[PDB]
Amino acid sequence: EQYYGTGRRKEAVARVFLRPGNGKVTVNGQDFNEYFQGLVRAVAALEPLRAVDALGRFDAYITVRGGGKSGQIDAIKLGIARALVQYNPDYRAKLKPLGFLTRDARVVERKKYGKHKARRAPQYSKR
Amino acid sequence: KIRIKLRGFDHKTLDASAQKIVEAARRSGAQVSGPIPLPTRVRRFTVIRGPFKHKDSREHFELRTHNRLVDIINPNRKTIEQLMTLDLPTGVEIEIKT
Amino acid sequence: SLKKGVFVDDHLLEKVLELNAKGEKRLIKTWSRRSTIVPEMVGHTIAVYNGKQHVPVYITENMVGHKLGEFAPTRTYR
Amino acid sequence: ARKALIEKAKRTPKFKVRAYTRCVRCGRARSVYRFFGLCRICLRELAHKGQLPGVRKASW
Amino acid sequence: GNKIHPIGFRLGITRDWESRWYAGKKQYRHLLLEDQRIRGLLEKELYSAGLARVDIERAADNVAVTVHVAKPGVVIGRGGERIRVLREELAKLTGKNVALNVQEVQNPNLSAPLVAQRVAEQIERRFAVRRAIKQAVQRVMESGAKGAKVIVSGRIGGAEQARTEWAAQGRVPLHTLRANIDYGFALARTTYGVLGVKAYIFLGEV
Amino acid sequence: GKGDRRTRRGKIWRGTYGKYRPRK
Amino acid sequence: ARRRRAEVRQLQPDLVYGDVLVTAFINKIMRDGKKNLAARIFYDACKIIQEKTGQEPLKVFKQAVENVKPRMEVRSRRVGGANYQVPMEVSPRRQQSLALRWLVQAANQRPERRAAVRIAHELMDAAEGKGGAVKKKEDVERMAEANRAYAHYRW
RNA sequence: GUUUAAUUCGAAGCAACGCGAAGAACCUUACCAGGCCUUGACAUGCUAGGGAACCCGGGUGAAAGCCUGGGGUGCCCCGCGAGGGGAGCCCUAGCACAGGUGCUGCAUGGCCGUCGUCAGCUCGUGCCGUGAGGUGUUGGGUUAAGUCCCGCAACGAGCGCAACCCCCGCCGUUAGUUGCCAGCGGUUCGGCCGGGCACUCUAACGGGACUGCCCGCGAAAGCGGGAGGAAGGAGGGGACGACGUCUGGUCAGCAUGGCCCUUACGGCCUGGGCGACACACGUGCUACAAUGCCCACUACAAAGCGAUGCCACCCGGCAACGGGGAGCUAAUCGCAAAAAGGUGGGCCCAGUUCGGAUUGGGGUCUGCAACCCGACCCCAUGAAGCCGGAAUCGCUAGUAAUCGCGGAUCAGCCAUGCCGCG
Ligand SMILES: [Mg+2]
Ligand SMILES: [Mg+2]
Ligand SMILES: [Mg+2]
Ligand SMILES: [Mg+2]
Ligand SMILES: [Mg+2]
C-alpha cells in the first residue's frame, strides 16, 4: 500500500516512505514545511518531483535518525527516488542520465597523528 | 530462558564459541534465536613510536572487545546438562544472568 | 580558597601556643610555611624559611588570610 | 635512582599525597598507563612482541 | 633504521598471540602481572634446551601453560624430578591450577629465535661471525626451508667500529601478509659487550 | 599560570576531573 | 600542477533561478562555512530591485557581469635575468571567476550598514558603467593594452 | 640569553623549541639549601646476641630520624616434665655486597627520524670486453610509481610499487533487550505495552569494479567518452616504509663494555626551583566586529567513557557547588546540555551591549596543605586591538575555513599541547 526508500549521505539516516496521497509531508511529526523553516536547500530536498512533474501527487512519511542537517536533507533527495522503482520502475531514464540516483558519498577524513584537522600540518619553521 | 552474552577480543574465537553454544541446546532442545551481535567495543590506544624526541610518527593500537549475545526461549532441563558439559571452549569469558 | 574550615600546621601550635602560657617571647627556628596567618598570633615573630635561610617579620593585625610563606621571598632577584 | 624509586612506590607513606604509578619491566615513571602498568615503551616492546592479548595494531 | 616488528605487523592475523585469554576490565594487569614473570622465569632457566615460544591458556582461575622447546630430555628431568617439580614450584608465586605441556620439535633449525639463540651461543664463544651465519643461513634453507635472512650487528672482532653483517639466500617478502615469517630476538653479552643477532626465516604462503 | 596552583585564571589547560569535580 | 591539466569542478545550479551562474556567486559570498546565511544576502538583495524598479534581479545581474569581465590582461613572468610582467588576453572561464571574486570583494568596501545593500549597489552601479568592479576591471586593461608594444612573446 | 644559591639533563635548519612530558605544590625529581641515615630503599650468601612472626603507642624531634614501652610468641629433630636444637622472619654488630638520571649514542644492542612513499637495490643465464666492469635497469613514450608499452643483445627473477590486512560507498544472508503504529489492540497520545524483525541500527561471512562492453582516437601501453552500475579507469582514507647516507637522536624507556663514585656522586624528609624577566623566536588561544554581537524560545549527532565509579532527579543555592538518591558492573543507566543552526526583540558603526588582560573584594568546589604555583561564578575594573612591513605558513575536496563532542596517565597535579568524532 506504499513504497519505502533508504537515504544515507554523510553518515545520516533518513527512512523514506512513499504513499499515494495528496499533500501530507512531515518528519517525525513536526512538519517538513516548518521543521525546516528558514532554509535554502529546502526546496532541493523534494526535487525528483518537479523534475518528474509529479509533486502534487503522492505522499510521504519521513523518519530521520541522527546525522547532519544538510546530510539529513541530501539523503531525502535519494530515498524518494530510492523508492517507487519497485512498482514504479520506469522512473529511471529521466533521472539517472540527469543524475540523481547516486549517493554522492563524501564521508569525512579522520584526524591523523602528526597533523591537525586531518590534513592541515602544523606551522613549518626552518629557523 | 537463562541469559548469556559472549565477550571476546577476537570474533573468530567469539563467533565460533557463539556458534559452539548453539550446539548444546538448539540441537538438544527447542530452537534458539541465533547470536545477537552487539556493537563491538574498542579500547583505542595510540602511542608515540619513538622513545624520545620524535613526538610525531606515532602508531596506533586497538584492544577491540567483540560482544555478542544469545537468548534461549525455552530452558530445557536436559539441554542445560549439555551446556556445562562443553568444558572444551577457548580463551573467552562468558556470564550467565537471570 | 579556604572553604568550610581553616588550618595551621601541628607542631606550629607546639612551637607557638607554648608562647602564651605566660604570653611568652618571640624567638623561634622552625620549618613550616603553607600555614595560615593566625589571628590569635599577631604578637610574635615567626621563623620562615625561603630556601637557604629563615627570614622572619613582625606580624601585624592586617595579616590574617594571607600565608606565612609570602613574607619570606625565595627567588632572590628583587 | 633506577633501583631506588620503585621501592618507594610500594610502602605508601604520606597520605593520598604521593600516590603515583610505575611501569613494571621498564620501571619508568611517567607515560605509564593504569591499564597495562607499562610505560609507552614497556608496552610496545611487548605489544609488537605479542604478550599483550587482543592488542593488535590499529588500522582504520 | 625502519621496518617495524614483522610479528608486530602480523599479530592480529596469521600467527595468533603468544598467549590466549579474554580479560575483564580491572583484572587485566592483575592477570598480566604474574603472567609475564612466567615467561621471564624461564628465559634463563629453561634456556639450555632452546626456548622459542610459550603460550598461556586461561579463562578463569585455572591456567594452562604450554612450552615449545626442541630439547626436552633435560627439562623433563631423569623421571619427573624436573617437569613435575617445576609445576609445583611454580604455584609458589601464583596459587593457580598448575598445568603444563611440552610440545616436541621435529625440525629445530626452522624457528627464527633458535637460530639467533644458536648464533649468540656461538657468538659468545670466540667464533667466526660471518662464517657462523653462512653455515647457519644455509642449514636453515637446508632443512626444507625456502628463504632466510639473519642480520647481526655490534663489535665484530671487538674493533672500535660497529658494522652489521649479512647472510641470506632467497626471498623474504617482509611487507606481505600471507608470507608467514618468524622473527628472532637474540642477545649476546660478551667480552666487549652487547650484540644484536636477528633472523628472518620465510616459510610459505596463503 | 593558567591551570596550576594558586591563582584563579582559567581552566582550558588544567582540566577538572579529580581536581575538585564530583566523585561519590 | 605540472603534468595533466586537471579537472574543473562542475557546480550545483541554482534552485530559484535556472542558472549555474547564481549558485556560482552565492557560494562565493559564503564565509566561515556559512551557506544559508549567504543566500539571504543575495536574495534579500534580489527582493529589492523587484521593489526598486521593473528590473528583474537576474536579467540585469548578467549585464554588469559582462561589464566586469575584461578582455586582455597582464601576467608576471620572469625572463632574461630580472623580473618584468607580460600581458595577454583573458581566459573565458577565468574571465568569469575573475569577475565574481571582483564583485564580492566590492561589497565590504561600499559604505552600507546592513548586508545586501553592499551587494546590489556594486551590481547596479556597474549595470551602466560607474562601479568599483568596473574601475579595477579596466585598470588591468589600462595596465594591459598600454603594453601593446610587447609583441614577440604574446603567443 | 639574563639572573638567582638551584633555575637538573637532553633535544639544535630542513630532522629542536604545545619535543622525552600523555603530569615542574611537596615525592614525580633527576636541581639547590638545611636536617639525618649508613650492609642500607633492593637482591643472593655466611658469623654473633636478642629474639619467631605481627599488631599497638609515646616523648622528643620541623619530618625523617632517635630513644622507649604493652602485647604477643608460630612451624620441624627429642624429652610430659626443669630444659638442648633447627628453617623462615625482624632488630642490633663484621662482612661478600649491592646501588648511581655519574661519564663516553664517537665504543654499543634495541627503538626513532630524514632522504621518502622518493623509486630505486640487486641475482641466474646469455652477450660485449685481456680485465676491472658494462648490458639487463640505458633510448622514445606513459603513469603516483623500474607502472607499463615500443625498440634494444637481451631474456627472466628476487627485495621494493602495487595487491593479500583495516575503515568508509552498494547490496545478500544470518541474528533481534537499539529501533517500530512502516499494519493492528491499551494508551497519563512517551516506543510506555501486547505484539512483530522489512525498515533503523548492530557485527560475522560473502557478491560486486576487472578497461568488463560498446562509439571513436594514438600501433602499443594509454586517451575523450558513453551506457549499465552506487561508484570507471587507484572510488576515497589508514596501517605497510627496500639497498643505503646522515660516524643522525636516544647510557635519561631498558640492557650493556670501559673509567669513575661506595662513609659517599648511594638513601629519607621539610622548604625552595625548572612558572624566575629589560628582552627575542617557535606553536597555539581571542580578537581587533553588522555574512555582526547579546537575551529568550525551538530540533539533528558520530565516536569515546564510567560500581566503590558515572550522576539523572528532588531540594537548597541569584552561581561553581552542597544533602538525599533512582539506574547502570554496562546498544538499556548515565557523562549528555552540543555550537554554527531556525524564530523573535534589542544594539544602527561606536572604540561599540566586539574582545576579555590586569587588578580590589567576595565564594563553593580535592586533597595532610592551594602565596610564588587551581578552576568556575558574582560587583566591577574593562588595555592594546580599526587588519598588520620586509617576509613567510598549510591547503587540490567534504580538503581548506568555521562550529562544537570525547578519550588517554589519576590522591591532586602541568590536558587550549596530543590522539580520536562529528
Ligand atoms: Mg594482518
Ligand atoms: Mg553509492
Ligand atoms: Mg648515530
Ligand atoms: Mg570567547
Ligand atoms: Mg551561569
Curated annotation (Swiss-Prot), chain B:
Presence of keyword Metal-binding: no
Keywords: Ribonucleoprotein, Ribosomal protein
Listed InterPro entries: Ribosomal_uS10, Ribosomal_uS10_CS, Ribosomal_uS10_dom, Ribosomal_uS10_dom_sf
SMART domains found in the cross-reference section: Ribosomal_S10
One annotated Gene Ontology cellular component of this protein: ribonucleoprotein complex
GO molecular function: structural constituent of ribosome; tRNA binding
GO biological-process terms attached to the record: translation
Claim: Lipid biosynthesis is one of the keywords in the record: no
Pfam families reported in the protein's UniProt record: Ribosomal_S10
Oligomer and partners: Part of the 30S ribosomal subunit.
Family: Belongs to the universal ribosomal protein uS10 family.
UniProt function note: Involved in the binding of tRNA to the ribosomes.
Protein name: Small ribosomal subunit protein uS10
Species lineage: Bacteria, Thermotogati, Deinococcota, Deinococci, Thermales
Swiss-Prot record, chain D:
Cofactor details (free text): Binds 1 zinc ion per subunit.
Key words, A-Z: Metal-binding, Ribonucleoprotein, Ribosomal protein, RNA-binding, rRNA-binding, Zinc
Single GO MF annotation: rRNA binding
Chain segments annotated as transmembrane: none
Pfam families referenced in this protein's UniProt entry, alphabetically: Ribosomal_S14
S-S bonds: none
Top-level taxon: Bacteria
Its biological purpose: Binds 16S rRNA, required for the assembly of 30S particles and may also be responsible for determining the conformation of the 16S rRNA at the A site.
A GO CC term attached to the entry: small ribosomal subunit
NCBIfam families for this protein: PRK08061.1 (NF005974)
Subunit structure: Part of the 30S ribosomal subunit. Contacts proteins S3 and S10.
Cofactor needs: Zn(2+)
Name this protein carries in UniProt: Small ribosomal subunit protein uS14
GO biological process, one term: translation
UniProt keyword annotation of Glycoprotein present: no
Gene for this chain: rpsZ
InterPro entries cross-referenced by the UniProt entry: Ribosomal_uS14, Ribosomal_uS14_bact, Ribosomal_uS14_CS, Ribosomal_uS14_sf
The keyword rRNA-binding is annotated on this UniProt entry: yes
Chain positions recorded as Zn(2+) binding sites: 23, 26, 39, 42
Family of the protein in this entry: Belongs to the universal ribosomal protein uS14 family. Zinc-binding uS14 subfamily.
Signal peptide feature range: none
Source organism: Thermus thermophilus (strain ATCC BAA-163 / DSM 7039 / HB27)
Curated annotation (Swiss-Prot), chain E:
Coiled-coil zones: none
Annotated CDD domains: KH-II_30S_S3 (cd02412)
Keywords: Ribonucleoprotein, Ribosomal protein, RNA-binding, rRNA-binding
Cysteines engaged in disulfide bonds, as pairs: none
One GO CC term on file: cytosolic small ribosomal subunit
GO molecular function, one term: structural constituent of ribosome
Gene3D superfamilies, per database record: 3.30.300.20, Ribosomal protein S3, C-terminal domain
Biological process (GO), any one: translation
Domain of life: Bacteria
Pfam families, per database record: KH_2, Ribosomal_S3_C
Domain KH type-2: 39-107
Described purpose of this protein according to its UniProt entry: Binds the lower part of the 30S subunit head. Binds mRNA in the 70S ribosome, positioning it for translation.
Family note: Belongs to the universal ribosomal protein uS3 family.
Subunit text: Part of the 30S ribosomal subunit. Forms a tight complex with proteins S10 and S14.
UniProt-recorded name of the protein: Small ribosomal subunit protein uS3
Species of provenance: Thermus thermophilus (strain ATCC BAA-163 / DSM 7039 / HB27)
Gene coding for it: rpsC
Swiss-Prot record, chain F:
Keywords, ordered alphabetically: Ribonucleoprotein, Ribosomal protein, RNA-binding, rRNA-binding
Keyword rRNA-binding: yes
Biased composition (Basic residues): 1-12
One Gene Ontology cellular component: ribonucleoprotein complex
Molecular function terms from GO: rRNA binding
InterPro entries for the chain: Ribosomal_bTHX, Ribosomal_bTHX/bTHXc/bTHXm
Stretch list, region Disordered: 1-24
Stated family: Belongs to the bacterial ribosomal protein bTHX family.
Function of the protein: Binds at the top of the head of the 30S subunit. It stabilizes a number of different RNA elements and thus is important for subunit structure.
Description of how the protein assembles with itself and partners: Part of the 30S ribosomal subunit.
Name assigned to this protein: Small ribosomal subunit protein bTHX
